[PDB]
């Protein structure tokens, strides 16, 4: 904050909603609580300029968990190649994969 009155008075007004790893109602975890927790605990007090270089793979894992297409691109190409080669009879799905 520009003029951080909250730390001066020790009063919480918006810090509860800033991050996904905060105390959620009924202790409902976030989808990416673990990754956000690891990334935040990584770059705390270290500096917002050292965070990019030092805590990089933590933030990369967190942003993946948020959006997930180093995993969904994997799936898309898997499905594309499957539908490709099944067309002319190279592969047939196993019975458990269609019923």
């Amino acid at each position: 904050p520009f003029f951080d009155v909250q730390k001066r008075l020790g009063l919480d007004l918006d810090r509860w909603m800033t991050i996904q790893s905060a105390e959620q109602p009924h202790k409902i975890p976030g989808r990416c609580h673990a990754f956000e927790k690891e990334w935040i605990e990584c770059a705390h007090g270290i500096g917002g300029i050292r965070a990019e270089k030092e805590c990089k793979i933590e933030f990369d894992d967190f942003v993946e968990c948020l959006l997930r297409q180093k995993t969904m691109k994997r799936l898309s190409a898997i499905k594309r190649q499957r539908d490709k080669l099944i067309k002319e009879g190279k592969y047939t799905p196993p019975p458990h994969h269609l019923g």
């Binding site: 003029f3 951080d4 009155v5 001066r8 007090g45």
Partner: protein
């Protein structure tokens, strides 16, 4: 530069540590000049209200200079503390990084090849 220094507590003029520094002298030329701005503000105030700018409202002018000097003192103490902090962070970083602050193998002008330009 220093808004992100560790240990800073927001919204307070002097962060307690500054009392370890020599307080600015009451005679300080910066302080008295800021008192002069107090006198000047009185002169416009009387002039702005069609008043005997020199003699009118001695109390009003006296309040103006007194108010400027008080805020002048605290600003000067705040001003000096930051400059002291700048030097503190400087030299501490200098000592903490000897490799990035090389020393120079001192030699005299008798061995420096300084080219001479004939002034024609």
């Amino acid at each position: 530069m220093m808004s992100g220094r560790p240990g800073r507590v927001p919204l307070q003029f002097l962060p307690n540590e500054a009392r370890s520094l020599p307080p600015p002298k009451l005679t300080d030329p910066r302080l008295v000049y800021m008192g002069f701005l107090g006198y000047c503000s009185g002169l416009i105030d009387n002039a702005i209200r069609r008043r005997p700018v020199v003699s009118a409202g001695l109390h009003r002018q006296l309040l103006y200079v007194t108010s400027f000097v008080f805020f002048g003192y605290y600003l000067l103490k705040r001003q000096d503390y930051m400059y002291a902090l700048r030097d503190h962070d400087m030299f501490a970083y200098v000592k903490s990084h000897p490799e990035d602050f090389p020393e120079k193998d001192k030699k005299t002008y008798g061995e420096i090849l300084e080219e001479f330009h004939p002034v024609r």
